[PDB]
Ligand binder design. Sequence first.
Ligand SMILES: Nc1ncnc2c1ncn2[C@@H]1O[C@H](COP(=O)(O)OP(=O)(O)O)[C@@H](O)[C@H]1O
Length: 296
Amino acid sequence: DFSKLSKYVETLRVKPKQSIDLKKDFDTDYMLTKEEGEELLNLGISKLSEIQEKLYASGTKSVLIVFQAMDAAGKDGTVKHIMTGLNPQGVKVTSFKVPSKIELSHDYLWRHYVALPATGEIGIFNRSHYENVLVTRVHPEYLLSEQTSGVTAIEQVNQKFWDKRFQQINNFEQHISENGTIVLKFFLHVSKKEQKKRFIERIELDTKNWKFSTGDLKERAHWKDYRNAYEDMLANTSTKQAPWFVIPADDKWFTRLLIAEIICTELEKLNLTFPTVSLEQKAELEKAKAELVAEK
Ligand SMILES: Nc1ncnc2c1ncn2[C@@H]1O[C@H](COP(=O)(O)OP(=O)(O)O)[C@@H](O)[C@H]1O
């Protein structure tokens, strides 16, 4: 069961006042066996599905879950594994890609605001608004195609620009959080060494190499720039109301376990329950059964 897991999970939450060194302080691989994790993961997925059903039936809340990671951290597989357990009618996964021409004619939050979950729904942001302080920070020339960014030469970008953005993001998440949205953000943290192992494995297998983009190496070459961006992001946009969690990503079964456990534990704070049947509704059910029974 969950005895020690419960305490370890709490260490993964980024506290608001905390400073962040991903190299030193957050292990990309870490208590239980893999066999035990797999069975515990299957309970977590079943509980999450019961929570989803209660949320959908009478929740006064919506749920927004964010995933961000470096390439080959296992994001896509984690998202998939979570979905397989859940009902499609109350859960929507939006995978955010390079902005379209229309999206670039709007502020960088617009396409995310558009996709927010409705009351009783779980929205999964597979990549998110945080892209606007990650890939665009490493590659500030993308800011030049953003008609709304106010950036005409990359020389203009400095720490005040990112600070301003952290303030906008926090104000956005605070607003939706004050209007019924439970927001959970996950950073899947893969080591450089494990990323290389996975890249090479994908290059060598005909079942995956048709899918491999050699562009991923170019982003790996910016590892330190990405690390700086993640650290600054985590240090400034984790709040008690909208927390970040840093999840070790080098063992995939453990990644998934941790995320399922954290989502269940956080949503259990809502004290959701299934609707109950009043005496009046009980009489109606019984009258319906009597009618079926009386049928010619
Ligand atoms: N706001 C953004 N600005 C620029 N690029 C973005 C933005 N949001 C997402 N992207 C980029 O879109 C790409 C999506 O890559 P893709 O292979 O389709 O998906 P994934 O890697 O999530 O499975 C990533 O390179 C990501 O950095």
